[PDB]
Amino acid sequence: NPVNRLSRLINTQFWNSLTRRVDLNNVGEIAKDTKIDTPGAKNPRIYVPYDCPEQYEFYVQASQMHPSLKLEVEYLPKKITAEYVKSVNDTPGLLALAMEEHFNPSTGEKTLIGYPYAVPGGRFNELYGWDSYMMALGLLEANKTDVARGMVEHFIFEINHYGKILNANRSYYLCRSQPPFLTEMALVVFKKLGGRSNPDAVDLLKRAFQASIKEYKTVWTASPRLDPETGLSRYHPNGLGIPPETESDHFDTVLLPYASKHGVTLDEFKQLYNDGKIKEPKLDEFFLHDRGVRESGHDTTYRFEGVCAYLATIDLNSLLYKYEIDIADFIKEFCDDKYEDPLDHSITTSAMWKEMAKIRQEKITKYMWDDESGFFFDYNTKIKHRTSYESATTFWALWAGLATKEQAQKMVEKALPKLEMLGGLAACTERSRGPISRPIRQWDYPFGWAPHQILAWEGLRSYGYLTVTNRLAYRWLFMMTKAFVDYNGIVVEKYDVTRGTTEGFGWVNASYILGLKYMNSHARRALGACIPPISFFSSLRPQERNLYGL
Structure with a gap:
């Protein structure tokens, strides 16, 4: 089987x-x-x-x-x-x-x-x-x-x-x-280790949270990444000149114009740039966003082409909300509610951290939420304006737990349908990708990605929509199975969730085991048979069709 x-x-x-x-x-x-x-x-x-x-x-x-x-x-x-x-x-x-x-x-x-x-x-x-x-x-x-x-x-x-x-x-x-x-x-590694009952576990939890707070204080809520106006953060790393490890021809096409404005070969213009000898500032800005894209891990997408470093995304700010809540918990539970930072002697209470999260929530709802279309769009902080880009990452708000019960219901109803294709959630709606001519970017429609799936599952199941997880988890597990069968025993990095023709791939592999957590005996049997989602839901008594939001 x-x-x-x-x-x-x-x-x-x-x-x-x-x-x-x-x-x-x-x-x-x-x-x-x-x-x-x-x-x-x-x-x-x-x-x-x-x-x-x-x-x-x-x-x-x-x-x-x-x-x-x-x-x-x-x-x-x-x-x-x-x-x-x-x-x-x-x-x-x-x-x-x-x-x-x-x-x-x-x-x-x-x-x-x-x-x-x-x-x-x-x-x-x-x-x-x-x-x-x-x-x-x-x-x-x-x-x-x-x-x-x-x-x-x-x-x-x-x-x-x-x-x-x-x-x-x-x-x-x-x-x-x-x-x-x-x-x-x-x-999760804490809980699996024993929780409070394993002393080695409680040591690791504390170290990982002392270190987590250091990351939060000194990377994400810290310039240049922090926008002071809105209070939110951006993927905006340091770093100089052309990224070395790329395919050597990668930037050759964007570099060539400038190289000829400055009257040298491509190589000379490269060296002269790395040596700082070129004041071409919009080229300096291009490479800012490229390095910024490489930090989002969505490498690449038209959501971020040339704009990434100025975007306070729902992606990062949902993750930070999670950091703020997990940290309040650690302090009220393991630090007697008094954490003083050994680096700068900063005294914080867990009430204070919660308060940090409360304002993040209000800010994110402010600049990003769209009660009409159902999404949490990213906010641009230079152009000071919201985006029209419908991203699968809108669900990270639920994973993190910053969206309201009211907001989620609006998102499931209005936004999840713009994203739910045959085998799961595309990274972005077809509208927002645009047209192709403009090559296709791998984090764009029609692709769907293991991390997006895994976070939306847990996020929906958190706000009480597990019936919707089950349907989404089927469409994924199915499309992964029919590929392992047809493609003759092979697992693939990204999947087209719209149509389908030796070590595995880390989070793809992991996506499978974690979606199977969500499947009953009947469903596994239908999966073994490679029954596409429409056929299989169709084949079900309306009481059990209710188990998949149908």
Whole structure:
């Protein structure tokens, strides 16, 4: 039965196919990085934080053992600056990550072994960003909890030494973040570990929340990302010049015009830009939004083409609302309601945090909500004006819990129909994508994406619309199954939710196990048979058709 074979292969072989764990012999293998091709990129290189000597000694010991790799091991500046990153663009490295202490039990000798993590696909080696949240949900259902907690340990380390959660732990990503989830990623690994009853769990929860507050205070509610006027935040990272790791021809077409306005070749105009010698400020702005897109993780979409860095999206501000509520909880429960920040001696009560969330809610409802069409549009903060773009992310408001009971009912009724295609939620309505000529962007209609599905499921089920989750979860699980059958045992990164023709893919895999949570015996049987959603709902007694909002 196909849904049992795939499910079986996710829970066992694919997760192992995607685990990574850093010890003294694979370091070379992991740190090898093709994405950049200059001289300096020829030897695998790892960079260590300035204040981690025990870990420096580790990777140096490691580099001597398999010296044929010519692995280089460099300490990082204490003060990591956009100007510095721009320099190491030609000498790129894999950033050191978390590491757990393990001791000999009769001699007592300390050993380092890297906490384990998961890649998004057999064609990667880096710990990626928000991907790791979804994947951690799957790993927890497959009772591989060691790998889920592993990644929380890494995200604390990333925040504590590189100052943010990174797109992925490589040198050339040090200036970009990803959508923040660490609060609820901490919570679920906490609950699965034992909750208050596991002391190791309660230690991890506290660390992950001390670190979460640092991220909130110093990344998202902090300039340049924070818009002071509205109070909301934008994906607006630092960073200089052309992103190195791209396809070399990528920007060649947008660069060529300027290169000829300045009367040089493409290469010379590239070098002269990276060296700061070009005052072409709208080109400086283009690359602002590109780096801003790379931070939203919606890479790319016409929702963000050239506008991303000025947009306070429902995406990020829904996630921050979640941070504000999860943090109030942590303080009133584990800090006796008095959290003083060890960095700046800032005394906050959980009442205060809740108050932060209350105003976020009002602000988001103010600039973003549209009681006619049912959506939460993004708000532009330079043009000071709302968008017409209907995004699947409007449901993050429910995932986070900032929308009112009244608002959700309006969204289910008026907005969910503009987005619900054959196999689930398209990333955006057909209207808002526009026409194609203007190539198609992969986060746009007709594509639908695992993270959008997973968040809308939990978000609907939170506001009481589980009957609607069940219908949506069917259309997804079905379309994934018929592909694994037809495409002859293969799983795919993105899916067309409008029509349908060896390691899995992280959050796709995880999307499957988590949607099966939502299916009864009858439904699984109809899935095994590859019965399309219309046929199957049709085949049902109206009492049970009610279970799918029909």
